[PDB]
Every structure is written in structure tokens, then in C-alpha cells.
């Protein structure tokens, strides 16, 4: 369960069904090339979403 595959970094992930879509996704990522680049498509959250922590990270 704690595998956490890196589809962007590693190519042996991305099974056959989603292959073309992830390919277009890495291409869009690499040819966008902003200041921040991301290695995980779904980084939503882990366990909890704190309002105090968000306001502390904000100004």
C-alpha cells in the first residue's frame, strides 16, 4: 500500500490503459517548464487539512 509510484520519474509505471494520456502529460509538463516542476500528478493531501497551517504558510 505504501508503494507511491512515480509515474513521471519512472517509465515502468503508467500501465497500458493510461499510456497515451500520461505521455501527453509529461510532454506538456516538460514543454511548459515553469519555475516549479512537479513529479506527481495527484498530490492532493495525506490525512488532514489545517486552516491554521495554511494561514501560517500564507501572509
Amino acid at each position: 500500500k505504501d508503494l507511491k509510484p512515480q509515474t513521471f520519474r519512472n517509465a515502468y509505471d503508467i500501465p497500458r490503459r493510461n499510456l497515451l494520456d500520461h505521455l501527453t502529460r509529461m510532454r506538456s509538463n516538460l514543454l511548459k517548464s515553469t519555475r516549479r516542476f512537479l513529479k506527481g500528478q495527484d498530490e492532493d493531501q495525506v490525512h488532514s487539512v489545517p486552516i491554521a497551517q495554511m494561514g501560517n504558510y500564507q501572509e
Binding site: 513521471f8 520519474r9 519512472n10 517509465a11 515502468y12 503508467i14 500501465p15 497500458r16 499510456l19 497515451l20 500520461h22 505521455l23 509529461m26 510532454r27 509538463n29 516538460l30 514543454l31 517548464s33 516542476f37 513529479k39
Partner: protein
């Protein structure tokens, strides 16, 4: 660039280090130019049958012209034999004079794709396309792709290096016609190597990082792997039959060259898995 490299290949003896420097630079930056099959097809035969045949049939062959070819080839369902006459004389023509004929054949391969044409005409078109490939490859690829799109946005050279699966976006008629499928295979292999070069240049340009090289490796690996997968799905028999053998042979040849170039790709394709109907014929072929 390719034609000038061939001329330098001819005139190696006079030029001291220029031929070396240029061939190193092309092998550094234009691998889809310096693919091997085009060069061996350039090396040809010194049985001189082509030269004698040219010297004794080109003569004054009533001045075949691209406009005449265009007229007969627009009226081709009324007249196939005049077209095949003209392209016979065109195969008799040489590598340099073929250039004004590049516009017609590529832009009008659609009526060739229409069923009923003889594959003598098809193989004549294929051989002329090889000769134009050894003379002027890049614009030839652009016109071929932009005329092999199914029945029409107009792709560019940079777009083709960005996304070479557009080469596989073509007719199922292309898929089931043998020699045009060989043309498609050459364009596919070339643009895959071109995509490697272009991502190389774009990453080295954009540096103005280690994750960027790993992302390049991942994108290229998944890229040619997805190309292989599309080719295998082409090898799958369609529901309609429920030509195919020659198509499977050509795709098996191209897969053989890719596997020899990089056996990592065999590992990744086999980890992704493909239809087991395709499995035994690919086992026999590759």
C-alpha cells in the same frame, strides 16, 4: 544537408578534415538524417545497370512534366497507364532532377490509397520516395505526413518532432496497404530519433535539473514504447476480416531494428504487455 554530405562522401579525397567534421556533427545532432538504411540504399550496386539503363532510355523521352503528371494523375481513374508510363520514366530519372516532382506524388497519394490501383504503380511510387528520401528528406517527410492525414490541419516540422505519433495518425487504408505502410514506418523511425534530438536541444536550451534528465529519459522511453504499442495494434487483425501478412512483416522488421538499438525497450514493452493474439506472430517474426 543530406545531399551535401553525400557530395562530401564522394569528394572525400580533396577535403582534408571537413568530411570528418561534418559527419561527426550530423552524427551528433541529426541522427534521423544519419540513419543507416537510407545510406546503404544510397550505396546501391556497382552492376551499373541503372547507369546503362539511364543512358540508353532517358534520351528525349517526350519531355514529361509535373503538370502533365498532374493532369493524368487527376484523371487517373480514367487513365492509369499514362501515369504508370510517366512514373516509369521518372524512375529512370536521376536523384537531382527528381526535386520538381516532389510536390505531385506526395500531395496526391490519396487516389493511390483508393482501392483498385496496381502495386506496380505503388512500388514505383515507393522507390521514387526512397530516392527523394536520400536526396531531400525533411520536406519530403512534411509533405508526406500532411498528405497522409485522413480525409485537414497542416502539421509543421517542429510539431512532428514534438509528437511523432501523428505519423501513426493515418488511414486504416494506409494500415492495410503494404508499401505505403513501409513509407509510414520510415517516417516513424526517423521522427522518433528526431524527437530524441529535439528534446535534447530543448532541455539544453531551457537551462537558462537532474530531474530534467530523468524526465527526458522517462518521456523518450514511454514515447517509443507507445509507438511500438500502436504498431502492434496495427498488426492485430480487425473485426472485418473475421496484405495483412506483408504488413506484419514490415512492422516486425521495424521492431527488430528498435530492439537491436535498445533492449531496454523490449523490457518495457513486455512489462506493459500487449495482446496475446499478437504474441505468437511477433515471436515468429522478431
Amino acid at each position: 544537408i543530406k545531399f551535401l554530405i553525400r557530395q562530401a562522401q564522394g569528394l572525400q579525397q580533396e577535403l582534408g578534415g571537413l568530411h570528418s567534421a561534418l559527419l561527426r556533427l550530423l552524427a551528433t545532432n541529426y541522427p534521423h538524417l544519419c540513419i543507416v538504411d537510407d545510406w546503404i540504399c544510397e550505396e546501391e550496386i556497382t552492376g551499373t545497370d541503372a547507369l546503362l539503363r539511364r543512358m540508353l532510355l532517358t534520351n528525349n523521352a517526350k519531355n514529361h512534366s509535373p503538370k502533365q503528371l498532374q493532369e493524368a494523375f487527376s484523371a487517373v481513374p480514367v487513365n492509369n497507364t499514362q501515369v504508370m508510363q510517366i512514373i516509369e520514366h521518372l524512375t529512370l530519372l536521376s536523384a537531382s532532377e527528381l526535386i520538381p516532382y516532389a510536390e505531385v506524388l506526395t500531395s496526391n497519394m490519396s487516389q493511390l490509397l483508393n482501392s483498385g490501383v496496381p502495386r506496380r504503380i505503388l512500388q514505383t511510387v515507393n522507390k521514387l520516395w526512397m530516392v527523394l528520401n536520400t536526396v531531400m528528406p525533411r520536406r519530403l517527410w512534411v509533405m508526406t505526413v500532411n498528405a497522409l492525414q485522413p480525409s485537414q490541419q497542416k502539421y509543421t516540422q517542429n510539431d512532428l518532432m514534438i509528437d511523432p505519433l501523428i505519423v501513426l495518425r493515418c488511414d486504416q487504408r494506409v494500415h492495410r496497404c503494404p508499401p505505403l505502410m513501409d513509407i509510414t514506418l520510415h517516417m516513424l523511425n526517423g521522427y522518433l530519433l528526431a524527437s530524441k534530438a529535439y528534446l535534447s536541444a530543448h532541455l539544453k536550451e531551457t537551462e537558462q535539473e537532474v530531474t530534467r534528465e530523468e524526465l527526458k529519459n522517462a518521456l523518450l522511453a514511454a514515447q517509443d514504447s507507445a509507438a511500438v504499442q500502436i504498431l502492434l495494434e496495427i498488426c492485430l487483425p480487425t473485426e472485418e476480416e473475421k496484405n495483412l501478412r506483408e504488413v506484419q512483416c514490415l512492422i516486425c522488421c521495424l521492431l527488430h531494428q528498435m530492439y537491436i538499438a535498445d533492449p531496454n525497450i523490449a523490457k518495457l514493452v513486455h512489462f506493459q504487455g500487449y495482446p496475446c493474439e499478437l504474441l505468437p506472430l511477433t515471436v515468429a517474426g522478431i
